Write a new protein. Structure first.
Lengths: 419, 418, 419, 418
């Protein structure tokens, strides 16, 4: 397809790392996904008695000192600490040895939807109570979104392309796709790519609550996230990070890397419709998926698994069903599609990264993760949405969808790598 | 070069738009740049007695009603209003007509370094004084960084690739280079690319002041920004936006577009050194410029003009001189390099977009804009830095450099088009 | 020793701040100390063409607006501006959050040797030329010595014990030692203590010049301050400030404070000998150091480093050698003693504060700062005086000595804190 | 109380010395205090037509040759001569014999608020009219505040702790309390402690005048100082000194010393409010008195006499009434409180030492000295302020308050010795 036509340089995944509401690493998170475990709970880290939503997907038991000194960590917003944890895990998982001979060829693209909201909140309190002199000196470099890419490159000595995306739900999906573009173009041999988020502060839960975006099912938080279910009432805000080591194929082979999967395509579109609520036909999402398949040189009939956007929103969920039916026709009923957000909630800038990882693991393990809480599928939601329980099945090709605020769409295509 | 080797699809600039401390459009800004005028003044829009820095580069007399309904505008942070203004100007300037036939082929990549800080500060006040149910419903959609790309795409019906960079000083440079990559790769025929910033709130001036990053020359704000001058004492915080319509060459030719210049190379690197100060030898900046020249298929001797990063910081300015000397050797004495931030201050996420525009206009007008305030060049700062006054000269190739917090580097290469 | 016998409440250092001739903060000053850099230069801030000494240790590039508004600062003598800058730095460095629950427990003891000499000079000029009605209304509250403690308590809301010492060279050493007494006694949990000076006006340089107290080595000001060198010819007048946050140990531990060191003893004596020239045997200084060691429960053999008084005076320097030989016997040859005044000059009321800080940093970094310019040690000056270059070495215990006009002696004892 | 809990070592007063506007020693001053005599008069010792205040509390007929050679004296500012006179009087009164056996155990803590202002003004004149080489060689050593402690230690051979406080009105109170701390802690057995002031020069009367801090009642100087009177218009500047020999009790007992009273508590606080005016509720003063009572192990109902700060200022006087009412509740109407500054004026750095002496003599003689000039008590000034005339009464416990510029507070607690 277009990717292979534009460069002979193929892109594979050789390392993964994650923090999620289900685990402090990939295997612990994935065990929870396959078991249909919810990571959603009442928030403990702050008092939400005055808030309309008092629950979400928190990282439980994170220890930044597994990754950084206490002193290094005090300077850094949680979204940075999370993105470094995922990145360091991914690089360790890859087995790559960074040297003087390769450091220029290794870059970073780690993004965030909202970035350092907690630090911004803490410094505004200092500003209003005591004045600008009590703002932290580390406020800017500890809070701006590109500092995951910055600090990761400083800690590991990575001198390749260095940047950060910020596209809401699509952040992690653009980051990975544009990192694959760098490698195939020849600007890098390796990229650490993905995203991180920690928006569970007063401003984040309050801001999404004021926009009426969030589920308010406080009495049963594990049932709140119910993509395609007729009783859904908005998304669950979740925290964490995902990172993937992307690598040119011959570079991976020459060092005896373990290859999880190949990244064979990347599609994008804009809805040009509305800030939050996509068109009911999912026309934009449909263009994005077709662009991704043409990029990969795949026919729709070759797709086995879709890791949906599936945020548990009235407008969003049904648009995605329509887009899949448009792109896949009869094959819509043969593929499996699931929303892992049923278990993790919506990790916003990290969603696309953690979901790329789940898509790769679906290929490794030949199993479609479930959509939990899909008790009463809404009108039209009659596909195999892997309701309730994991489904073992053949998976050669897995898509990951992200349809983010502003109508910004991205789709990744992963495929088994034979070796 | 590498870009030509990877795709036959050339990328040209067909439209430009801007808000800057020097003007409310490109021509008014550029007239200011060539006259050596300062856009820096004491900040009027808030009170700053408790701050060590009370001046910056403001956008003066912005009228959002030239671009949006007063309705639409009320919901949006100034960085979004600024981004939209530059974007709309660039699309108007391009002469491009969006139709059902091409809308899937036109995308947007508008970034910001810090985004909707004013809105975040105002909503934090509501939260602390009155609780979370008094936060504005418009807070998230009117504040998050990708809403410039989102709102532009909705208003103009653009259905191509849609995303947003956030790379501090490098934002506008990455936004433009990665948009050019999209077009050359084939996933768009047109992109609107650039950045915007309005970080002059208490958190912004306060935050950069707490880091001791800003000039504190309150008595003489127009002399504060003095890149490579021995008495520089940090950067000047500025507001604005820049946007460029990038276009595949056959698509531009087919509609009889006016072509300002060609985008021939884009280079990136990471210092992997320090969170804010570059290495003294500018090794990262040097790698980044070499990568961009190699992308463009240019020998260093083919470069005429460099629009510097040149933020007026002690460590940053001298590293860029070291990097240019490293890359260019004896040719470092033949090219002209200037920092327009001497006049504009540092527009952070918009710096790379307004300076790309300044680079393209240097090619159009065959003139190197000045580095004003360069009274006493520091030790080793002995290049043609176009001190004080614009220099008419031959300019076939113009570079634009951005060396951002975290050591993130980007360079663009523009060339005269035929 | 006596301190531990009189109270179970231990005193630790959790924050430090400084203005000196070597830097506008602690790390910049300390980098200069360890490099053997001189901060002494011809004075620029006034015309000294008619003066016998034209050089000193000035604060270079101070920006009061990093700490106060222009309008607030205009009312305050430079010695006050300097003391507030050091105090605000120390409190920020401590990370302590001042609240309604603790403000009564936080006090201030910031002193000065001479206080508001510049403001007094400017107001005398107004008085003699225009009469008493042109004296500034802020002249008293902007000039009297206790107004560093006053303004610091008003700005930060500190309601604990509030006072000011004035003991010439010993000012900063008494301020810190008596602040530690307050905390151990139970009168405070926290004290901001130290001192500040800006005596470089016509009256200060002229007054010390008339007393023949100052070096007149105008042709080579960086060589003027040469403690224990046979060619010394009096002290160098220097400006600046030092402040330390002293804190009860369990109070520091309970808030997760970073602890630099423990303040384990404080000694005092009077020479009862002479206004300026101590006895040749240093009998007073020797009693003061022994008092400090007995206060700390230390034997002389446990002392590793002494930050000397060492002002570069004929009588003073040799008295301190004698006192160290008397107190330490054979161990006098194993410890290291240095005068940082070789680099900073004599900061008078701030000396004891900046030198306490250097003693604490010698413990943090395990390095003895040099005595620069010690080219030809005088008769008897045969100890390890760390001549020329910093000396990395084991330092568990550091003393700071101040032997001030009137024969007023103080010694602080700092020791590593294990955590 | 806290002091007894922290050390078994009790502190007693065995000697007292004074210069005041009422006399050249303690019993002449005290005779004046008990007769309600004013020490305030037009200043003779300079000319004051250009000043809004031309009167104060001077020391009358001081003969330094009773204490020093005319040689020794010529080198010393009057504040030093005054501090030494009070110190020598206190040591004589104490009966203490300094020997080789005890000299290391006897220290000094004599403070001043402003120090050698007369000398600084005279040397400033030399500097301005004739240049820096006409400044006196005696200027620094005869002017800096710690030279009272320095010269006393040299003259009497005292080798104990040696220091000097400078806390405006609180100077003498801090000097005495912190000297008591030294003794109870064990770092001395004897301290000479107090303060001295001679600020009646052009800079002092001029400086306090420019701040509008002084009474301007030039027609009736003896009526100027009127604490808590509705027609008060600022303080009266006075000169002098006070010193007390503080002594550990077993040390006093062992030499058969005469013990005047015991020092049983010392309290401190900061207002953290304003540079010169206290909060109207006297919250800082209240905290300071409570701390002192808690240090002494006394219930408020055990207090019989308060020697007030009571400087005759609008904000200060009423804050102290509010603080006493807060601390003492219904007992505020049973105790007697007076301001001896009604007679002495404000001795600034010496106020705390002379008033400590007055508190001790109130215990000795069982009499509350008067607040003279208290003709028309202000709104809410309805306590027993001992208006007009001394009041014989039972006094077991006497407080002395000092509430100084910068909001620095100190209270001493004295008790009859049993």
């Amino acid at each position: 397809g277009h990717m292979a036509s534009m460069s002979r340089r193929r892109v594979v995944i050789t390392g993964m790392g994650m923090l999620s509401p289900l685990g402090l690493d990939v295997p612990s998170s994935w065990e929870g996904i396959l078991a249909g475990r919810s990571g959603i709970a009442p928030i403990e880290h702050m008092d939400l008695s005055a808030y309309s939503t008092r629950f979400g997907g928190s990282v439980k038991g994170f220890n930044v000192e597994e990754y950084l000194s206490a002193k290094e960590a005090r300077k850094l917003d949680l979204f940075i600490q999370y993105g470094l944890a995922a990145s360091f895990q991914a690089v360790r998982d890859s087995g790559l040895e960074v040297t003087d001979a390769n450091r220029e060829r290794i870059g970073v693209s780690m993004g965030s939807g909202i970035g350092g909201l907690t630090n911004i909140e803490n410094n505004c309190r200092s500003l209003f109570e005591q004045g600008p002199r009590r703002i932290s000196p580390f406020f800017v470099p500890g809070s701006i979104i590109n500092m995951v890419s910055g600090f990761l490159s400083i800690h590991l000595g990575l001198q390749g392309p260095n940047y950060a995306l910020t596209t809401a739900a699509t952040t992690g999906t653009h980051s990975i796709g544009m990192a694959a573009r760098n490698i195939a173009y020849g600007e890098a041999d390796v990229m650490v790519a993905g995203g991180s988020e920690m928006a569970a502060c007063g401003l984040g839960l309050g801001g999404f609550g004021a926009a009426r975006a969030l589920s308010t099912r406080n009495d049963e938080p594990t049932r709140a996230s119910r993509p395609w279910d007729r009783d859904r009432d908005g998304f669950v805000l979740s925290d964490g990070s995902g990172a993937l080591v992307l690598e040119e194929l011959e570079h991976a082979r020459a060092r005896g890397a373990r290859i999880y999967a190949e990244l064979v395509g990347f599609g994008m579109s804009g809805d040009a419709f509305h800030m939050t609520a996509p068109p009911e036909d999912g026309a934009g999402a449909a263009r994005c998926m077709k662009n991704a398949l043409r990029d990969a040189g795949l026919d729709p009939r070759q797709v086995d698994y879709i890791n949906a956007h599936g945020t548990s929103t009235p407008a969003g969920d049904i648009a995605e069903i329509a887009a899949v039916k448009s792109v896949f026709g009869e094959h819509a009923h043969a593929l499996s599609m699931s929303s892992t957000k049923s278990m993790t909630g919506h990790l916003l800038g990290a969603a696309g990264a953690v979901e790329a990882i789940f898509s790769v693991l679906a290929l490794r393990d030949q199993v479609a993760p479930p959509t939990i809480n899909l008790d009463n599928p809404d009108e039209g939601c009659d596909l195999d949405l892997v309701a309730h329980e994991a489904k073992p099945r053949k998976i050669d090709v897995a898509l990951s969808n992200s349809f983010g605020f502003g109508g910004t769409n991205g789709t990744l295509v992963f495929r088994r790598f034979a070796d």
